[PDB]
Write a protein that binds this ligand. Structure first.
Ligand SMILES: O=P(O)(O)O[C@H]1[C@H](OP(=O)(O)O)[C@@H](OP(=O)(O)O)[C@H](OP(=O)(O)O)[C@@H](OP(=O)(O)O)[C@H]1OP(=O)(O)O
Ligand SMILES: Nc1ncnc2c1ncn2[C@@H]1O[C@H](COP(=O)(O)OP(=O)(O)O)[C@@H](O)[C@H]1O
Ligand SMILES: NCc1ccc(-c2ccoc2)c(Cl)c1
Ligand SMILES: NCc1ccc(-c2ccoc2)c(Cl)c1
Ligand SMILES: NCc1ccc(-c2ccoc2)c(Cl)c1
Ligand SMILES: [Mg+2]
Ligand SMILES: [Mg+2]
Length: 325
């Protein structure tokens, strides 16, 4: 069997807390009334919801209404309890209300509105300083939720709302988030393909908060190198091969051996042999103004196969890459 693993930080935060904090199945959800909200327009969609801009008619304030689609009721209770636990945390989206549609029996979550700036319009305008600034804001949200015993497990650009004009950043979409319990074996079918950590791809179930630090590394690589996504897998198996084409196959076997992971033998047919690439090889004329020795050193410390070797969110905040913020 595989070697057990635990987070290096905030390991026993849920162990020392009462049942009410982490037992989301037992949590009493009090559903408000939808009549306080008038829907304005569709803002987005996801594999799990339909998201609308709305107005709260009791204070003329804009809100966001996330109407939840057919899914396990256990999953909705989990998302509600985590949002309630993290409510008020730095750069965490604020859950304002929970309402139901009497007729169709459909639950909806009501959030604070974020005036999200478009990514395609943002990319070219983003400077080295702006990347450092926003990366730091995400770290504040991750250090906070990890300190609260929660793993986000779906860190990606689509789940980060930025109101560039107000330099306001919010980490959203807590639908895949989970309570960290040391030694727990989690479902590896989480995160979005390009952002999945090697632990998920090799089916190592005892992962932790460090999964979020890998995803953050993928976002940083994509921003500084202007290559979106950075690891462009066409499926979950190919995703590991794309990582192996950068980090090399030697360190992948060291990781598998350290945790006694039973690697699916089909991988030995597609992985091949790949040398470890230097991060400097991703520097080109279009991205050199965003790359620096500090940026490459910070990225190298997040994008590691070994989930225990990655920087924690607090260690990342102390990195020289952030001295200017
Ligand atoms: O980053 P770009 O210069 O835009 O090039 C990428 C990249 O190709 P290179 O890595 O060879 O530059 C992708 O290839 P992979 O990294 O995925 O192997 C490819 O994606 P597909 O292979 O899925 O086509 C993508 O094409 P697309 O824009 O259709 O995603 C293509 O972009 P360009 O064609 O714009 O260069
Ligand atoms: N608070 C928000 N402010 C503005 N837009 C948001 C907000 N929350 C969600 N959105 C939009 O709705 C989309 C879907 O968000 P989300 O429902 O949380 O994820 P999913 O359905 O994929 O689990 C986002 O990608 C974004 O475009
Ligand atoms: N079903 C997941 C789960 C929930 C709670 C705990 C717990 C917390 C404190 O003592 C045991 C553990 Cl270890 C696992
Ligand atoms: N007052 C109009 C209206 C109508 C329906 C909804 C709804 C929320 C969740 O499901 C439906 C909401 Cl939020 C508002
Ligand atoms: N909502 C799309 C989007 C766009 C840009 C970033 C970014 C930029 C620099 O650091 C993070 C992020 Cl996190 C998300
Ligand atoms: Mg989403
Ligand atoms: Mg959300």
């Amino acid at each position: 069997g595989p070697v057990p693993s635990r987070a290096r930080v905030y390991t026993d935060v849920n162990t020392h807390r009462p049942s009410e904090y982490w037992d989301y199945e037992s949590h009493v959800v009090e559903w408000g009334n939808q009549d306080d909200y008038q829907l304005v327009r569709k803002l987005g969609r996801g594999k799990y919801s339909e998201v609308f801009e709305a107005i709260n008619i009791t204070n003329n304030e804009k809100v966001v209404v996330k109407i939840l689609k057919p899914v396990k009721k256990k999953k909705i209770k989990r998302e509600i309890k985590i949002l309630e636990n993290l409510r008020g945390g730095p750069n965490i989206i604020t859950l304002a209300d929970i309402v139901k549609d009497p007729v169709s029996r459909t639950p909806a979550l009501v959030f604070e509105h974020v005036n999200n700036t478009d990514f395609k319009q943002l990319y070219q305008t983003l400077t080295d300083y702006d990347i450092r600034f926003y990366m730091y804001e995400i770290l504040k949200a991750l250090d906070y939720c990890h300190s609260m015993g929660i793993m986000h497990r779906d860190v990606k650009p689509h789940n980060v709302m930025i109101d560039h004009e107000h330099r306001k950043l919010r980490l959203i979409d807590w639908g895949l988030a989970e309570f960290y319990h040391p030694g727990q074996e989690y479902n590896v079918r989480v995160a979005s393909r390009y952002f999945k950590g090697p632990e998920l791809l090799v089916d190592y179930q005892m992962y932790d908060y460090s999964l979020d630090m890998w995803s953050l590394g993928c976002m940083l690589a994509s921003m500084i190198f202007r290559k979106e996504p950075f690891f462009h897998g066409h499926d979950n198996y190919d995703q590991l091969v794309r990582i192996a084409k950068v980090l090399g196959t030697e360190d992948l076997y060291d990781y598998i051996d350290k945790y006694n992971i039973e690697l699916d033998p089909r991988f030995n047919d597609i992985l091949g042999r790949h040398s470890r690439k230097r991060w400097e090889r991703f520097v080109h004329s279009e991205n050199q103004h965003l790359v620096s020795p500090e940026a490459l050193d910070f990225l190298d410390k997040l994008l590691r196969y070994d989930h225990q070797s990655r920087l924690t969110a607090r260690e990342a905040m102390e990195h020289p890459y952030f001295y200017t913020v």
